[PDB]
Amino acid sequence: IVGGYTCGANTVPYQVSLNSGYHFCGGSLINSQWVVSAAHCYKSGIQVRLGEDNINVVEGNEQFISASKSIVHPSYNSNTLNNDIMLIKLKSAASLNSRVASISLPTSCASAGTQCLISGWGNTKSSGTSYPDVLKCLKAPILSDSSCKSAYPGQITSNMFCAGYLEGGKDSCQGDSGGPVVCSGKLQGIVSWGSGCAQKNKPGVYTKVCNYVSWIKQTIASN
């Protein structure tokens, strides 16, 4: 997260870190046994880490649970990043409390101008590199699809939205991938892609979760 603030330990209780020996992507706990992330975060040997603040220090609230299966969206295209979404089932159900809670799926899509909270442990610089140990947060509005398409000619599909600031300076980044965009108490987006980070006229592009709610509900009902 470039240009954000320190969340505060366990203030974003649905945030997960995906670990394969190290943090490589974020994710969102949507129920006691399922996490949503970006399909571009797929790999084997994922351990889901819940209840994290400092991902390098065991501080007491963590639950480390291995994934039993992962399901990449049937129509995911890695070249265009269309349908960039994936479900991960936990080997055991998490224990849900105040510090570890699920986030609700949307009943409807969010409108341009809606304020959102994006979080993750990704890079905090646009040109340089510096990875935080603790969780970073950013409030950012959903942009109009017109401005989104103007910024990224020929690249924005119906399964994508932009959020952030056209002036730059504030954005998600590498390492934040797969993580939550929560608006109005609902998971509306997944950190997906962008040109660089926090560059002028290049906002963050996010998987449009409201388009996938049926697929998500149907998949977890049979798996």
Ligand X SMILES: COC(=O)C[C@H](CCc1ccc(C(=N)N)cc1)c1cccc(C(=N)N)c1
Catalytic residues: 40, 84, 177
Give the residue, chosen from 33, 119, 194, 210, that forms a contact with ligand X under the rule CB under 6 A.
194
Nearer CB in complex with ligand X: 180/194: 194
Contact flag: residue 177 with ligand X (CB under 6 A): yes
Task: For residue 220, report the phi and psi dihedrals to the nearest 5 degrees.
Answer: -80, -15
Task: Confirm or deny that 204 is annotated as ligand binding.
Answer: no
Pick the piece of the chain touching ligand X (CB under 6 A) from 43-51, 97-105, 144-152, 190-198.
Answer: 190-198
Contact flag: residue 80 with ligand X (CB under 6 A): no
Give the residue, chosen from 29, 116, 173, 187, that forms a contact with ligand X under the rule CB under 6 A.
173
Task: Confirm or deny that 115 is annotated as ligand binding.
Answer: no
Pick the piece of the chain touching ligand X (CB under 6 A) from 67-75, 121-129, 149-157, 180-188.
Answer: 121-129
Contact flag: residue 176 with ligand X (CB under 6 A): yes
List C-alpha distances in Å: 205 to 94, 136, 141, 142, 178. 30, 18, 12, 10, 12
Contact flag: residue 196 with ligand X (CB under 6 A): yes
Which residues contact ligand X by CB under 6 A?
A: 40, 123, 125-129, 171-174, 176-177, 191, 193-194, 196-197, 204
